[PDB]
Amino acid sequence: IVTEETGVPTTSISVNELSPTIINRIFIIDAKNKIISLNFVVSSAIIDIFSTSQSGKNITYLLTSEGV
Amino acid sequence: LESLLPYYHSRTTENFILELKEKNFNKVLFHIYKSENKYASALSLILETKDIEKEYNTDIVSITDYILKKCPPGSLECGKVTEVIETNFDLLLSRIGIEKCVTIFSDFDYNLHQEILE
């Protein structure tokens, strides 16, 4: 999954200006046992996901705005 | 009603406050009090509002920290803040608790810990 939050507004804090969108946080949830696999940050955004591999193992791919 | 406040800069008299007090909006009052930085009466509104909604249930300990985040160097109008804290010590422990109250009062004033023997 991919998560976009862009800060959080509340009465206690003050919004100085148009805050830049915090870059997407990526989670990999796991079935059976309950655990969180990974949580890191990416550069700009996500365009599309391929996520294929012919071998026994499988790999995923992401494409950002500038392209990584 | 919130959006009219910047346009309503031509009138900010206490008469507008009376109607909001009568109908108990409990949000526009806090928003207005944040502007002039009075911080005294709004502090009462921190515990006066029995209901919770969105203004409460978030940063309950941190709302008290934010309202107490005032007059760093000296007294600077916070004497009435100390007096209203002293006059309402008993019910304050009911809401916040015990372990958090001593931590909050530790960095503010040791003499506020004196009002415990009653």
Swiss-Prot record, chain A:
Subcellular compartments: Vacuole membrane
Note: Present with 1200 molecules/cell in log phase SD medium.
Function description: Required for vacuolar biogenesis and for trafficking of hydrolase precursors to the vacuole. Mediates transport at the vacuolar membrane where it may be responsible for tethering transport vesicles on the target membranes. It is required for gluconeogenic growth of yeast. Acts as a component of the HOPS complex that acts during the docking stage of vacuole fusion. HOPS is an effector for the vacuolar Rab GTPase YPT7 and is required for vacuolar SNARE complex assembly. It remains bound to SNARE complexes after vacuole fusion.
Family: Belongs to the VPS11 family.
Subunit note: Component of the homotypic vacuole fusion and vacuole protein sorting (HOPS) complex, which is composed of a core of the 4 class C Vps proteins PEP5/VPS11, PEP3/VPS18, VPS16, VPS33 associated to VAM6/VPS39 and VPS41/VAM2. HOPS associates with phosphoinositides and the PX domain of VAM7. Component of the class C core vacuole/endosome tethering (CORVET) complex, which is composed of a core of the 4 class C Vps proteins PEP5/VPS11, PEP3/VPS18, VPS16, VPS33 associated to VPS3/PEP6 and VPS8. Interacts with PEP3, PEP7 and VAM7.
The name this protein goes by in its record: E3 ubiquitin-protein ligase PEP5
Taxonomic lineage of the native organism: Eukaryota, Fungi, Dikarya, Ascomycota, Saccharomycotina
Portion of the full sequence shown: 276 to 343 of 1029
From Swiss-Prot, chain B:
Superkingdom of source: Eukaryota
Subcellular location as annotated: Golgi apparatus, Golgi stack
Transmembrane intervals: none
Recorded family membership: Belongs to the VPS8 family.
Further remark: Present with 736 molecules/cell in log phase SD medium.
Function comment: Required for localization and recycling of the CPY sorting receptor (VPS10) to the late-Golgi compartment. Involved in the retention of proteins to the late-Golgi. Plays an integral role in the complex vacuolar protein sorting process.
Protein name, entry field: Vacuolar protein sorting-associated protein 8
Source species of the chain: Saccharomyces cerevisiae (strain ATCC 204508 / S288c)
